[PDB]
Every structure is written in C-alpha cells, then in structure tokens.
Amino acid sequence: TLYAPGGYDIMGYLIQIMNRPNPQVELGPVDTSCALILCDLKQKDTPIVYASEAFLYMTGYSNAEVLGRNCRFLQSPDGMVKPKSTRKYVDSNTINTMRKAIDRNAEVQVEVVNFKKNGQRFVNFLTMIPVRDETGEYRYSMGFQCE
Ligand SMILES: Cc1cc2nc3c(=O)[nH]c(=O)nc-3n(C[C@H](O)[C@H](O)[C@H](O)COP(=O)(O)OP(=O)(O)OC[C@H]3O[C@@H](n4cnc5c(N)ncnc54)[C@H](O)[C@@H]3O)c2cc1C
C-alpha cells in the first residue's frame, strides 16, 4: 500500500461530504476531532491510508498498526480477520451489508461489534461515505467511528 506523498485533503473531503446533494444516511455535522479513517478504493483490499488521532486512540492501535490494512481487523479481539472468513463475534449480515455498500459506492451506516487492541469489546456506530478525488470520480471512502 502506498500513500499520497503530500497527504490527504481530509478537510476538503469532509466539506465535500457535508455538501453532498443526495445524502442517504444521517451524518449531520462532523470534523477532524472525531474518529475517522480514509480508505483507498483503488488499491488492493481497500487499505486505510489515513487515520485520525481519535481513531487511533479509541481503538488503541498505532498508525503503524492501522495504515495499509483493511479495517476488518477490528472485528476480532486479536486484530486478525481473514477476508471472506465467517466471523465468530460479528453478525454476518452486518458484515455483508458493509461489503456490498462499498462495492456499490453506496453510503451505509451500521452498529458493529469491534475490539480494541487490548481486546475490549465495544459497539461501533459506523458510517461510511464515498469520496471523489481531484479527478471527480469516486476514489476513497471515509469512515466515521463512534464507540
Ligand atoms: C472507510 C472504511 C472504514 C471502515 N471502518 C470499519 C470499522 O471501524 N470497523 C469494522 O468492523 N469495519 C470497518 N470497515 C469495513 C471493513 O473494512 C470491510 O469492508 C467489511 O468487513 C466488509 O467487507 P469484507 O471484505 O470484510 O467482507 P468479507 O470478508 O467478504 O465478509 C463478508 C461476510 O458476510 C457473509 N456474507 C457475504 N455474502 C453473504 C450473503 N449473500 N448472504 C449471507 N451472508 C453473506 C459471509 O459469511 C462473510 O463472512 C470500514 C470500511 C471502509 C471502506
């Protein structure tokens, strides 16, 4: 996984999201003080390319343990979840809903059981919205996590 050398336009993307003409889920106002991440949809397995301070702190994982990985790792108390595996602590329907929404560039909002680095179980009120890069086409996905 590689990252944009100059960094990501997180604030620009936040504004883009709040300005979206056809919102499908209720986000309301959000900013960089929250736990959020940006994944690259044009790279293998939609890797995380940006994680806010709040996300790292809320989950207990460091930047080096988050960047370049699919966020599904939060689905196991040991931070290890293989793609297509049948999770034993997370509802399959919820996981499937997330997968199809991403594949369709459709907004989605769910409550999913996740685990912190120390293994603590928590419910993640998660919202994901597709983001267009400078080309005007969808390239990234911004996720908003809330314990
Ligand atoms: C920006 C962003 C932020 C994210 N943040 C989080 C986060 O904070 N926490 C989190 O947990 N995830 C998060 N995700 C989601 C995660 O990265 C994956 O997208 C999610 O787990 C679903 O995709 P998958 O690849 O894991 O699917 P898969 O590994 O393919 O798993 C799908 C599961 O659903 C079941 N299933 C599939 N199809 C069907 C069907 N037709 N009928 C019945 N069952 C079916 C299967 O049994 C399977 O185990 C985020 C994603 C993005 C893009």
Side-chain angles (χ1 to χ4, degrees):
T1 301
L2 237 188
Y3 317 84
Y8 297 84
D9 187 9
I10 300 302
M11 292 206 292
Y13 294 157
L14 279 170
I15 290 174
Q16 177 194 314
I17 291 173
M18 296 188 270
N19 276 276
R20 69 193 195 294
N22 239 181
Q24 296 297 142
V25 302
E26 261 288 340
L27 226 196
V30 275
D31 60 31
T32 63
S33 75
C34 71
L36 65 84
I37 69 173
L38 193 79
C39 294
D40 192 333
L41 302 171
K42 264 35 186 173
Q43 285 196 72
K44 155 134 165 286
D45 206 27
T46 187
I48 293 171
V49 291
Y50 169 85
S52 70
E53 336 64 43
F55 176 86
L56 303 180
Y57 175 59
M58 172 192 76
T59 63
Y61 292 92
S62 72
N63 231 353
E65 308 177 78
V66 174
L67 298 173
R69 279 210 290 172
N70 181 286
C71 210
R72 76 172 66 79
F73 75 87
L74 291 179
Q75 287 160 29
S76 177
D78 47 46
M80 277 175 226
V81 179
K82 43 286 121 175
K84 319 140 184 305
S85 68
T86 303
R87 281 64 155 180
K88 48 222 307 171
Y89 303 125
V90 186
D91 178 293
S92 291
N93 186 60
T94 300
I95 297 184
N96 184 47
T97 297
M98 293 194 276
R99 187 174 108 297
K100 295 190 301 181
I102 297 173
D103 287 355
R104 296 169 173 59
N105 284 322
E107 308 183 6
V108 64
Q109 183 167 269
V110 296
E111 300 186 81
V112 65
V113 168
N114 277 175
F115 297 94
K116 302 188 180 177
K117 179 175 171 55
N118 69 174
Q120 163 189 162
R121 178 199 181 96
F122 70 102
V123 182
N124 189 340
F125 183 39
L126 166 74
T127 303
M128 308 177 266
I129 302 175
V131 175
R132 300 175 189 289
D133 59 11
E134 189 58 25
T135 71
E137 296 184 350
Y138 286 131
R139 168 64 181 289
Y140 310 106
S141 181
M142 190 177 286
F144 298 93
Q145 296 69 32
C146 177
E147 177 173 0

